[PDB]
């Protein structure tokens, strides 16, 4: 089943952690990477001085159940997120065609249609994607205004 996972990091030199998280995703049992997006830059959300955020998206083929995949993403955050919090965020955006509303997991990710830093890398790797409700990703990006984010 093809899962789409968002990756974010707020480090000034995020590549080692991001790359380690990507390697780790590929090494999840019964899973492998399909496609890795470009890495995008987004500005911070508070007034104090801090680095920009890196954001990306990955297509991961997996035979695991969604909650199983969640457990691995949380494991990788703990193992590879050395810098603290926001230094490595892994979020399941979409999982096959499945709609999930459990305790631990909501799929499609509950805010992703509102977040350019999710949708732009996703569109790079899945330009023809259609959401469970029928909305085309391309349409969302052309009807909503989302700043075109630059390459990291
Ligand atoms: Cl690992
Ligand atoms: Cl491990
Ligand atoms: Cl939807
Ligand atoms: Mg593998
Ligand atoms: Mg998260
Ligand atoms: Mg709508």
From Swiss-Prot:
<keyword id="KW-0418">Kinase</keyword>
<dbReference type="Pfam" id="PF01288">
    <property type="entry name" value="HPPK"/>
</dbReference>
<dbReference type="GO" id="GO:0016301">
    <property type="term" value="F:kinase activity"/>
</dbReference>
<comment type="function">
    <text>Catalyzes the transfer of pyrophosphate from adenosine triphosphate (ATP) to 6-hydroxymethyl-7,8-dihydropterin, an enzymatic step in folate biosynthesis pathway.</text>
</comment>
<comment type="similarity">
    <text>Belongs to the HPPK family.</text>
</comment>
<protein>
    <recommendedName>
        <fullName>2-amino-4-hydroxy-6-hydroxymethyldihydropteridine pyrophosphokinase</fullName>
        <ecNumber>2.7.6.3</ecNumber>
    </recommendedName>
</protein>
<dbReference type="GO" id="GO:0046656">
    <property type="term" value="P:folic acid biosynthetic process"/>
</dbReference>
<dbReference type="InterPro" id="IPR035907">
    <property type="entry name" value="Hppk_sf"/>
</dbReference>
<comment type="pathway">
    <text>Cofactor biosynthesis; tetrahydrofolate biosynthesis; 2-amino-4-hydroxy-6-hydroxymethyl-7,8-dihydropteridine diphosphate from 7,8-dihydroneopterin triphosphate: step 4/4.</text>
</comment>
<comment type="subunit">
    <text>Monomer.</text>
</comment>
<keyword id="KW-0547">Nucleotide-binding</keyword>
<dbReference type="GO" id="GO:0005524">
    <property type="term" value="F:ATP binding"/>
</dbReference>
<dbReference type="GO" id="GO:0000287">
    <property type="term" value="F:magnesium ion binding"/>
</dbReference>
<dbReference type="InterPro" id="IPR000550">
    <property type="entry name" value="Hppk"/>
</dbReference>
<keyword id="KW-0289">Folate biosynthesis</keyword>
<dbReference type="GO" id="GO:0046654">
    <property type="term" value="P:tetrahydrofolate biosynthetic process"/>
</dbReference>
<keyword id="KW-0067">ATP-binding</keyword>
<keyword id="KW-0808">Transferase</keyword>
<dbReference type="GO" id="GO:0003848">
    <property type="term" value="F:2-amino-4-hydroxy-6-hydroxymethyldihydropteridine diphosphokinase activity"/>
</dbReference>
